[PDB]
Amino acid sequence: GQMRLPSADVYRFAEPDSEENIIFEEGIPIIKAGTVIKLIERLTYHMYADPNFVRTFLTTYRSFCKPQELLSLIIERFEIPEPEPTEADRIAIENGDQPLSAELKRFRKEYIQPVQLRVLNVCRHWVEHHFYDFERDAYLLQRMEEFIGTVRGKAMKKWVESITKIIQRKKIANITFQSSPPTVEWHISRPGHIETFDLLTLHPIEIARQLTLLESDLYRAVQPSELVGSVWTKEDKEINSPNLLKMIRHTTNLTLWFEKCIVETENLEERVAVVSRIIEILQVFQELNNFNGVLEVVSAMNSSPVYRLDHTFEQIPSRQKKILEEAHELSEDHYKKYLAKLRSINPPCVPFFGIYLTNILKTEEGNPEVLKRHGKELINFSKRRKVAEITGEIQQYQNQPYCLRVESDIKRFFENLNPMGNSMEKEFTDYLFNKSLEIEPRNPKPLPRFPKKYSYPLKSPGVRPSNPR
């Protein structure tokens, strides 16, 4: 028979399942909706562990439960009453004998110890992976420290002492590879000569490598706290989503820099060399699975000032036309080929974040917070599971590091890039479009000639790497 449970009057998590408090989707069950009490029961269930559910719940719960209330509820879950002695135990004790306590021992082993350990696993995951709740509420951290530090009894002792140490380390808070990174490549600009660094003077291989390291670091820094609740679109976005916004602003700045390099090169032959060099950088981005970088280039080529430069693109070698075409095709049909390519490559990679943002926002906006059933309001947990599937995908690509060496001067050059200067956006993008009209006027105006601006060789070193001994 099943174990008997405490009375639901003394322990709220013993209430029977019903459609008034939990609904399952159509081999562990998947929850569609439930009360917060039922969600916490299944989060810490005695029959099985559900690590995915712990991640989903801890990522999304603030949309339906405050952090202080969550802690109160899991402390209530932890404090499980033990059953009274049974008739056979009573008769043994009345005869001066030691009772067998069979039912008590089973309840301890099969209900209390698994539920309590799973409550501690929620606490451990909360502190390790969602510590921002405690950074933002010092009193919440005090309550967690007190709860963990006062759990008695030897069954939980190893994990209680461990969690105490983890909390203390988090309050005051190295990569190994299968091989060596390739040698840094140099072209016209030589090491240490940062004043000559530019699109055509740095090696295109190394431009793509150093931008990939920068963009990978920006991608890896975005936490789910910047995404849940669509907070990057709201009035406090600079407070709540600073790493995401830094990542997007880098992407925007590089796209605009590519556009500016192109349209400020007024001589046609030089401008062909500039566009060709950017397509070579795109080729290396593709080789590195830096899809953010690929789309930075494609967005620049499709911008209003650049797209119209028919005289320039007419002189691009056919093979480079094919590289740009197949990069542009990744975005067609609502990113169909991009999504398939991302799911096929071998990481490390740098995903394009924008699709994730649109899917999180539309999942939030397109599904109700609660489901009404039998007069009760149940938390719509399926909606939160869908959001956490997206944040889980994001996190999966944040794990793998690139085996590439940083060049501190090239890194600083791209960190400090500022194509707009002090100009506002409309000002600047109008300037780029007017430059485009200057260098290739609308038909039937004749095409003018312009003097060269570069004093160094325009020939590319190519994008196949070199290897001296």
């Binding site: 669509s230 990057w232 679109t233 709201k234 009035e235 976005k237 916004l245 997007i248 602003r249 992407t251 925007t252 796209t255 605009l256 556009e259 789309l295 494609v298 967005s299 620049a300 499709n302 911008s303 209003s304 797209y307 119209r308 975005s331 609502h334 924008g354 943002l357 649109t358 899917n359 999180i360 926002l361 539309k362 999942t363 906006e365 397109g366 599904n367 109700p368 869908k386 997206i390 956006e425 409309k426 479009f433």
Partner: protein
């Protein structure tokens, strides 16, 4: 077979723009959505007795990728320019969205509709007369929609398709 229309939704972020396409494409009568699903943005419809396929691009949430707007807009044949009726800044943004569409499409006469969206119960700050006057100054229709009751949603998209058909 049937004509496919490529429509693009543009407008300020953070003020409920995404509700327009969600409510259209939705199971009209079940409040639920999975945007990751292949063709959660394609819908076959009958407009004035003619069956057609709508393909709707709504990049809601990507507004900070401002240098990608040209690329996204380039894909469209007709545009819904959306503002929130309780956010005056989103209304003032409309002029620059329209100028950008005209530039990307290289045309002074691009099919488009102005949409004023009621996204919550906060106080309206853009009156319907202000928006009608703006739409008339541009020569385009004006449609108001509710983000909660689906009112106006079909009118907004069908009016745009009629603008494309009559271009």
């Amino acid at each position: 077979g049937m004509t496919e229309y490529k429509l693009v939704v543009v407008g300020a972020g953070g003020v409920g723009k995404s509700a327009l396409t969600i409510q259209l494409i939705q199971n009209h009568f079940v409040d639920e959505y999975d945007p990751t699903i292949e063709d959660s943005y394609r819908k076959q419809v009958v407009i004035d007795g003619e069956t057609c396929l709508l393909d709707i691009l709504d990049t809601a949430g990507q507004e900070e990728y401002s240098a990608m707007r040209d690329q996204y807009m380039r894909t469209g044949e007709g545009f819904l320019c959306v503002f929130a009726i309780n956010n005056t800044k989103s209304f003032e943004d409309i002029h620059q969205y329209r100028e950008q569409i005209k530039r990307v499409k290289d045309s002074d006469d691009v099919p488009m509709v102005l949409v004023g969206n009621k996204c919550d119960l906060a106080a309206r700050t853009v009156e319907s007369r202000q928006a009608q006057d703006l739409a008339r100054s541009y020569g385009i229709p004006y449609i108001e929609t509710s983000a909660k009751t689906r009112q106006g949603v079909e009118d907004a998209f069908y009016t745009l398709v009629r603008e494309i058909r009559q271009h």
